[PDB]
Amino acid sequence: RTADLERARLGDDGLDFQDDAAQARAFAQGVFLLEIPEWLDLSAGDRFARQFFQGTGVEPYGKYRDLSSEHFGDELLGYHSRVDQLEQFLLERRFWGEVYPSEIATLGEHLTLLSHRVLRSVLASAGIPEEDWHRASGGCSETNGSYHLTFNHYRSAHQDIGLSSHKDDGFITVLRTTAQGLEVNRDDVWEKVPVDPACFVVNFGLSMEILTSACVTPLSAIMHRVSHQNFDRSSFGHFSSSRCLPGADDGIYRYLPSAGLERVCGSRELIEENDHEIYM
Numbered sequence: 001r002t003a004d005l006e007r008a009r010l011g012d013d014g015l016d017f018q019d020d021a022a023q024a025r026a027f028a029q030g031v032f033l034l035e036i037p038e039w040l041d042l043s044a045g046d047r048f049a050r051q052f053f054q055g056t057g058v059e060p061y062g063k064y065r066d067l068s069s070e071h072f073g074d075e076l077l078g079y080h081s082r083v084d085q086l087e088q089f090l091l092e093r094r095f096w097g098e099v100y101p102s103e104i105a106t107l108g109e110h111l112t113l114l115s116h117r118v119l120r121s122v123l124a125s126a127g128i129p130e131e132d133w134h135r136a137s138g139g140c141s142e143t144n145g146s147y148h149l150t151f152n153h154y155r156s157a158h159q160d161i162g163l164s165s166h167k168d169d170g171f172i173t174v175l176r177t178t179a180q181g182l183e184v185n186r187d188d189v190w191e192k193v194p195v196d197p198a199c200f201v202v203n204f205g206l207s208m209e210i211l212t213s214a215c216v217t218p219l220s221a222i223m224h225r226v227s228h229q230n231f232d233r234s235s236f237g238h239f240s241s242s243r244c245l246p247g248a249d250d251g252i253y254r255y256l257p258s259a260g261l262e263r264v265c266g267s268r269e270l271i272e273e274n275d276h277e278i279y280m
C-alpha cells in the first residue's frame, strides 16, 4: 500500500536517476523522489508551514493569516481556508520580495531554480525541440513562468478528507513533506507516498499532461490526495505554471510532433477550472 518510487538527484548533467529504465518509469508514473541539496536550508519554510495560520500573536510568521486575497488583487493568493481539512497561504513570485519574509523569498528562489533544472531534463527527454521550450512551458523552461510558493496546514479537528483527490495545474510541483498522508493513485489503486525528509516529492501537473498528450510517451499528471489527518500536518510546495498574471497570460499548449504548439486554453483559466473541480 506504499508506492515504490524512483529516487533522483540533480547532478552535473541534469536529473540523474539510477539508470535509463528508472528514469523512464519515474516519468511514466508521473511522480518520483528528488534528493534535497545538502546546502539547502528548509527550516524557515518548515516553520512558516507550522505558523502561517495562527495569527499575529505567533512570531515570526503567524501574521500571514491576516493577508486575504483582497490584499493582492488576485483571488488565488493569500490565506485560504478550504472545504477540506487544508488551509493554505499561497503567493506568486511577483509578490515574494515585497510580501514574504526575506528568508522565505530566498527559499522560493532556490526552489524556482531547482525546478527549472528538473523541467528542462523532462522537456529534453520528451523530444520537444529546444526553441519551442519557452512558449511550451509558458516561461518555465527559463525563469519566466508563474511560481507559487504555497504553505499547507491540515486542521485535524475538521471531519474532512485532508485534501481531495486532484491533479496540480502546472508543469512541475516540488513538494516538501515530512509526515505521512500523501497518497497517489497509480493504476487505479491508492498508495501512500513514502516519507523521506531528505527528499522532495516531484510530480507533474495538468499542463505537463496536456503538453505531452500527443507525444509518443505521454506524461501524466498524477492523481493524488491527502488522507484524513487525526493529528495536525503541514507541508509546502513550489508550483511552476505557465505565466498566469491577470492581463499577461501565456497560454497552455499541446505539442503536435513534427508540427508545433497548438493553444489549448489559458493558464489562469486552467487554474480556476481545476480549483473549482478539486473542491466542488
Ligand SMILES: C[C@@H](CCO)[C@@H]1NC(=O)[C@H](C[C@@](C)(O)CO)NC1=O
Binding pocket: 076, 082, 088, 090, 148, 149, 150, 166, 167, 168, 169, 170, 205, 239, 241, 271, 275, 278
Ligand atoms: C497555481 C497554484 C494554485 C492557485 O489556486 C498552485 N497550483 C496547484 O495546482 C495547487 C492547487 C491546490 C491543491 O493546492 C490549492 O488548494 N497549489 C498551488 O499553489
Ligand SMILES: O=C(O)CCC(=O)C(=O)O
Binding pocket: 150, 152, 163, 168, 175, 177, 181, 182, 224, 226, 234, 235, 236, 237
Ligand atoms: O500536503 C501535501 O502533501 C500535498 C499538498 C498538495 O497536494 C497541494 O497543495 O497541491
Ligand SMILES: [Cl-]
Binding pocket: 081, 087, 155
Ligand atoms: Cl481555522
Ligand SMILES: [Fe+2]
Binding pocket: 166, 167, 168, 224
Ligand atoms: Fe497537489
